[PDB]
Design an enzyme around this catalytic site. Structure first.
Site, PDB file in Angstrom:
ATOM      1  N   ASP A  70      37.550  59.713  -7.312  1.00  0.00           N
ATOM      2  CA  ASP A  70      37.071  60.608  -6.256  1.00  0.00           C
ATOM      3  C   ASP A  70      35.637  60.209  -5.943  1.00  0.00           C
ATOM      4  O   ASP A  70      34.757  60.332  -6.807  1.00  0.00           O
ATOM      5  CB  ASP A  70      37.150  62.071  -6.698  1.00  0.00           C
ATOM      6  CG  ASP A  70      36.759  63.054  -5.587  1.00  0.00           C
ATOM      7  OD1 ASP A  70      36.858  62.700  -4.391  1.00  0.00           O
ATOM      8  OD2 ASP A  70      36.368  64.196  -5.912  1.00  0.00           O
TER       9      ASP A  70
ATOM     10  N   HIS B 130      45.850  61.754   2.586  1.00  0.00           N
ATOM     11  CA  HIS B 130      44.575  62.451   2.511  1.00  0.00           C
ATOM     12  C   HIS B 130      43.482  61.711   3.275  1.00  0.00           C
ATOM     13  O   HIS B 130      42.734  62.326   4.044  1.00  0.00           O
ATOM     14  CB  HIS B 130      44.188  62.647   1.052  1.00  0.00           C
ATOM     15  CG  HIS B 130      42.960  63.463   0.877  1.00  0.00           C
ATOM     16  ND1 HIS B 130      42.835  64.738   1.389  1.00  0.00           N
ATOM     17  CD2 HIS B 130      41.794  63.183   0.259  1.00  0.00           C
ATOM     18  CE1 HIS B 130      41.644  65.214   1.082  1.00  0.00           C
ATOM     19  NE2 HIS B 130      40.996  64.289   0.397  1.00  0.00           N
TER      20      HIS B 130
HETATM   21  C1  HEM Z   1      42.361  68.964  -4.497  1.00  0.00           C
HETATM   22  C2  HEM Z   1      41.412  68.643  -3.630  1.00  0.00           C
HETATM   23  C3  HEM Z   1      41.015  67.254  -3.311  1.00  0.00           C
HETATM   24  C4  HEM Z   1      41.210  66.084  -3.996  1.00  0.00           C
HETATM   25  C5  HEM Z   1      41.914  65.873  -5.318  1.00  0.00           C
HETATM   26  C6  HEM Z   1      40.612  65.036  -3.245  1.00  0.00           C
HETATM   27  C7  HEM Z   1      40.626  63.702  -3.663  1.00  0.00           C
HETATM   28  C8  HEM Z   1      40.125  62.678  -2.880  1.00  0.00           C
HETATM   29  C9  HEM Z   1      40.307  61.302  -3.146  1.00  0.00           C
HETATM   30  C10 HEM Z   1      41.017  60.731  -4.356  1.00  0.00           C
HETATM   31  C11 HEM Z   1      39.718  60.598  -2.140  1.00  0.00           C
HETATM   32  C12 HEM Z   1      39.655  59.085  -2.009  1.00  0.00           C
HETATM   33  C13 HEM Z   1      38.405  58.437  -2.640  1.00  0.00           C
HETATM   34  C14 HEM Z   1      37.155  58.750  -1.854  1.00  0.00           C
HETATM   35  O1  HEM Z   1      36.846  58.095  -0.831  1.00  0.00           O
HETATM   36  O2  HEM Z   1      36.409  59.670  -2.251  1.00  0.00           O
HETATM   37  C15 HEM Z   1      39.180  61.546  -1.228  1.00  0.00           C
HETATM   38  C16 HEM Z   1      38.512  61.177  -0.082  1.00  0.00           C
HETATM   39  C17 HEM Z   1      37.971  62.133   0.767  1.00  0.00           C
HETATM   40  N1  HEM Z   1      38.094  63.473   0.654  1.00  0.00           N
HETATM   41 FE1  HEM Z   1      39.113  64.482  -0.610  1.00  0.00          FE
HETATM   42  N2  HEM Z   1      40.044  65.550  -2.144  1.00  0.00           N
HETATM   43  C18 HEM Z   1      40.263  66.883  -2.093  1.00  0.00           C
HETATM   44  C19 HEM Z   1      39.882  67.835  -1.120  1.00  0.00           C
HETATM   45  C20 HEM Z   1      39.096  67.527  -0.009  1.00  0.00           C
HETATM   46  C21 HEM Z   1      38.672  68.429   0.994  1.00  0.00           C
HETATM   47  C22 HEM Z   1      38.980  69.901   0.979  1.00  0.00           C
HETATM   48  C23 HEM Z   1      37.932  67.702   1.930  1.00  0.00           C
HETATM   49  C24 HEM Z   1      37.260  68.164   3.176  1.00  0.00           C
HETATM   50  C25 HEM Z   1      36.739  69.379   3.344  1.00  0.00           C
HETATM   51  C26 HEM Z   1      37.918  66.358   1.482  1.00  0.00           C
HETATM   52  C27 HEM Z   1      37.273  65.321   2.112  1.00  0.00           C
HETATM   53  C28 HEM Z   1      37.416  63.990   1.714  1.00  0.00           C
HETATM   54  C29 HEM Z   1      36.768  62.931   2.495  1.00  0.00           C
HETATM   55  C30 HEM Z   1      35.899  63.097   3.729  1.00  0.00           C
HETATM   56  C31 HEM Z   1      37.123  61.771   1.922  1.00  0.00           C
HETATM   57  C32 HEM Z   1      36.710  60.385   2.374  1.00  0.00           C
HETATM   58  C33 HEM Z   1      37.635  59.897   3.510  1.00  0.00           C
HETATM   59  C34 HEM Z   1      37.179  58.554   4.049  1.00  0.00           C
HETATM   60  O3  HEM Z   1      36.273  58.497   4.916  1.00  0.00           O
HETATM   61  O4  HEM Z   1      37.704  57.501   3.636  1.00  0.00           O
HETATM   62  N3  HEM Z   1      38.682  66.282   0.340  1.00  0.00           N
HETATM   63  N4  HEM Z   1      39.493  62.823  -1.669  1.00  0.00           N
END
Ligand code: HEM
Ligand code: HEM
Ligand code: VOH
Ligand code: VOH
Ligand code: VOH
Ligand code: VOH
Lengths: 307, 307
Positions: B150, B223
């Protein structure tokens, strides 16, 4: 030759405590074989984490109750003093004897949690019924949540901690340890307003610097007076690995754990604190309450793998 | 002028999240003066911990909801986009808007906890009704409990994190940040049996090394496809400080938190994930569920002390 790795090391910053019951029945030879393979995996992963993350100063022990001993082994002699802590229920509250303790220590939560999580996934819910999972953490200046330093008179160094913490070489179950766990819930609403003189009378040391209050000036019911015990001119010392746990705004306290060469060293202190030696109770018990309790034996590394 | 100290720094190992409501009434001038003195104590203690324990990389922020803004200040204009997250309750579960967030980060739990506890004792139960206290911790390889890394596409470094995390210089409330918190409860029993191909399709990156799967080869409900959004050719990036939390053998998940220069950057991603833009939900929501939620604004350090 070697003990499990939670007794001798000092000053861990994190500890995870997993206590629960064995679901495998005495006749299930295949289930017990799988159980012992999961024990081997634990010892192997301890070594792997130590290699990859020496900064963690990782340690771990698997410990067994007297009630479960004859289920997990027909080869290793039962430690002669081991018994259920529930036999103390007539005078000590909170007893809750479980079959199994897994105690993991680290200077990093990420590796403490990794070993704990991997181990729970290996054994799994079909082998272990976990009754308590506690995430302990050291606080600034190693203070308990009473804000007194906890550990001042803990034995220091490998020599004394082997002497007081491990069954003597040449004895049955040599290099194992008797273990006592007891989760305390602190009543800090009651403790915080107490004058400093009352808090120091209660513990038996000064709060700022943990200087011993002279014996003739502190109550015989002070915590230090209750637990600094001797027999035949020999001190009944124990090796404590207790850590704070809990929520600032919720339930919190001390996850107490002690390792000892003899269960008697621990039990005599419990008799002292809980009124069985002279009818008097530890003053600390006005401010904190034990809510779990268990006796175990941590085998030597050799005996752990030969169960 | 500078921001509060939880937005720009990266890779914290511990985070404590305290969310709750203000007990001081809008008419209570002396209580509000005491409240702001406690805010000042927080900023001073951050500086003192930083001096004593540089290795902690300590950080902290106090953040305010739109509903409480005009109670805590009649001097600072309300940030233009600030609103209650409960306005999203028609399509997003778990909303639970609170008045106040205190977010503390550290590379050591002992200093994380010391600042959190000292702050809670300063404000006291008389001033704050705490509804949630979460102890977040980084896991090995910065993996979420799905065991995906993450943070891969989190903006890196002071320049980009100022651009996307902080209100621009020259604007009202410059160097403050819009904040969104949301506690997720993972259902790992549903996740673990999925094959790697399904897990990677769900997230949109590879599991072992977090390599982006090309956009035309992953579902639009992956996601990454739900959250990598743009408007008018500008990316709607946010600064995430989320950490795992919880019990191996109990409730566990991700304590999500994002900081942004504009609340819209966060809200558009929430509309995307929760089906409000095209009727389709994020695949990740098959495996985890939000159970709390709040919007806040973290003022600049100057505006925090000038409330
Ligand atoms: C159970 C909840 C969540 C999990 C397990 C999760 C996990 C992850 C993972 C594994 C990634 C890919 C690695 C990274 O680039 O950081 C990611 C990307 C991202 N997550 Fe989440 N996330 C969650 C909730 C959220 C929520 C609620 C938001 C927005 C309000 C969010 C916004 C993002 C964003 C903006 C990215 C980067 C996307 C990009 O530009 O490539 N996430 N998340
Ligand atoms: C709420 C639970 C407890 C708290 C907060 C607590 C706290 C402390 C403190 C502050 C000290 C003084 C500093 C030190 O020498 O370590 C101490 C000493 C000690 N405690 Fe406890 N303790 C607790 C329970 C127990 C229990 C249950 C035992 C025994 C089974 C025990 C055994 C000892 C011993 C042996 C010492 C050292 C005494 C000496 O030789 O001077 N404690 N404890
Ligand atoms: C046992 O495997 C590991 C132990 C500790 C760490 C910390 O970097 C990583 C590990 O595997 C990646
Ligand atoms: C239950 O709420 C609290 C309990 C304890 C403290 C500080 O010790 C603060 C609390 O709320 C602000
Ligand atoms: C005694 O006061 C402190 C001791 C240690 C730390 C961090 O290690 C911070 C302290 O006060 C802020
Ligand atoms: C509820 O008991 C458990 C839950 C989860 C695990 C590991 O994922 C192990 C458990 O018990 C051993």
């Amino acid at each position: 030759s070697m003990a499990q790795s939670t007794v001798l090391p000092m000053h861990c910053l994190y500890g995870i405590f997993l206590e629960g019951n064995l679901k495998i029945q005495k006749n299930d030879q295949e289930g017990l074989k799988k159980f012992k393979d999961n024990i081997k995996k634990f010892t192997l992963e301890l070594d792997e984490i130590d290699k990859i993350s020496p900064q963690s100063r990782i340690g771990g022990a698997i410990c067994f109750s007297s009630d479960i001993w004859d289920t997990v082994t027909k080869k290793i002699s039962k430690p002669k003093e081991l018994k259920s802590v529930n036999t103390l229920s007539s005078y000590m509250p909170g007893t809750s004897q479980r079959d199994i303790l897994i105690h993991i220590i680290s200077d990093r939560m990420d590796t403490c949690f990794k070993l704990a999580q991997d181990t729970m996934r290996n054994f799994g819910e079909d082998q272990l019924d976990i009754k308590q999972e506690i995430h302990g953490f050291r606080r600034v200046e190693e203070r308990d949540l009473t804000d007194f330093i906890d550990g001042t008179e803990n034995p220091d160094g490998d020599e004394l901690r082997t002497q007081y913490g491990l069954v003597a070489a040449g004895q049955p179950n040599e290099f194992g340890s008797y273990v006592f766990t007891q989760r305390y819930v602190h009543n800090l609403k009651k403790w915080y307003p107490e004058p400093l003189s009352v808090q120091q009378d209660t513990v038996g040391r000064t709060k700022k610097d943990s200087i011993e209050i002279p014996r003739d000036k502190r109550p015989i019911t002070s915590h230090v007076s209750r637990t600094d015990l001797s027999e035949n001119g020999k001190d009944l010392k124990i090796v404590r690995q207790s850590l704070p746990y809990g929520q600032i705004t919720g339930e919190k306290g001390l996850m107490f754990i002690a390792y000892a060469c003899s269960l008697h060293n621990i039990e005599k202190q419990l008799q002292s604190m809980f009124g069985q030696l002279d009818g008097k109770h530890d003053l600390l018990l006005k401010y904190t309450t034990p809510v779990t309790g268990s006796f175990y034996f941590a085998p030597s590394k050799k005996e752990l793998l030969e169960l």
